[PDB]
Amino acid sequence: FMRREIKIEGDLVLGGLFPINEKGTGTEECGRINEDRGIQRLEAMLFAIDEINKDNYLLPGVKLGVHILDTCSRDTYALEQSLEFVRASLIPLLIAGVIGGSYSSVSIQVANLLRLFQIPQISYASTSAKLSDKSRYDYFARTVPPDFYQAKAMAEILRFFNWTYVSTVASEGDYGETGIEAFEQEARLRNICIATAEKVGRSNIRKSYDSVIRELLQKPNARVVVLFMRSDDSRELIAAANRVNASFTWVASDGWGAQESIVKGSEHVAYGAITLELASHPVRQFDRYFQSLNPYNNHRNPWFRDFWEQKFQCSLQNKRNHRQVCDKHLAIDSSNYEQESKIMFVVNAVYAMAHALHKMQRTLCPQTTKLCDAMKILDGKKLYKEYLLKIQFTAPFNPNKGADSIVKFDTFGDGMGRYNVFNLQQTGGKYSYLKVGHWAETLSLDVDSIHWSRNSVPTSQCSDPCAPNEMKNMQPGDVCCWICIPCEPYEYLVDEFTCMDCGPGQWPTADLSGCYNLPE
Ligand X SMILES: N[C@@]1(C(=O)O)CC[C@H](C(=O)O)C1
Residue 138 annotated in ligand binding: no
Q: What is the CA radius of gyration of the chain?
A: 27
Distance CA 358, CA 395 (A): 14
Distance CA 470, CA 491 (A): 8
DSSP 253: -
Answer for the pair 145, 414: CB distance below 8 angstroms, yes or no.
Answer: yes
Answer for the pair 423, 451: CB distance below 8 angstroms, yes or no.
Answer: yes
How many residues sit in the footprint of a copy of itself (CB under 8 A)?
A: 14
Which residue number, 117 or 312, has a Cβ lying nearer to a copy of itself?
117
Which residue number, 82 or 104, has a Cβ lying nearer to ligand X?
104
**Residue 79 touches which of ligand X, ligand NAG, a copy of itself, none (CB < 5 to 8 A by kind)?**
a copy of itself
Q: Which residue is nearest to ligand NAG (CB)?
A: 162
In whole angstroms, how close is the CB of 155 to ligand NAG at the nearest point?
A: 15
**Residue 125 touches which of a copy of itself, ligand NAG, ligand X, none (CB < 5 to 8 A by kind)?**
ligand X
HEC profile of 105-173: HHHHHHHHHHHHHCCCEEECCCCCHHHHCCCCCCCEEECCCCHHHHHHHHHHHHHHCCCCEEEEEEECC
The answer to the question of residue 381 lying near a copy of itself (CB under 8 A) is no
Residue 127 annotated in ligand binding: yes
Which residue number, 369 or 473, has a Cβ lying nearer to ligand NAG?
473
The angle at the Cα of 470, spanning 465 to 475, to the nearest 5 degrees, equals: 50
Residue 125 annotated in ligand binding: yes
The answer to the question of residue 420 lying near a copy of itself (CB under 8 A) is no
Contacts to ligand NAG by CB under 6 A: 160-162
In whole angstroms, how close is the CB of 27 to ligand X at the nearest point?
A: 24
Cα–Cα nearest to 354, from 92, 9, 11:
11
**Residue 461 touches which of ligand X, ligand NAG, a copy of itself, none (CB < 5 to 8 A by kind)?**
none
Kindly tell me the burial class for residue 446, based on how many C-beta atoms sit within 10 Å of its own C-beta (0-12, 13-18, 19 or more).
exposed
In whole angstroms, how close is the CB of 494 to ligand X at the nearest point?
A: 50
Helices 231-243 & 206-217 angle (0-180, nearest 10): 60
**Residue 103 touches which of ligand X, ligand NAG, a copy of itself, none (CB < 5 to 8 A by kind)?**
ligand X
Among 60, 117, 315, 490, binds a copy of itself (CB under 8 A): 117
Residues at the annotated binding site for L-glutamate? 41, 104, 125-127, 175, 254, 342
Q: Which residues bind to a copy of itself, rule: CB under 8 A?
A: 79-80, 83, 86-87, 89-90, 109, 112-113, 115-117, 136
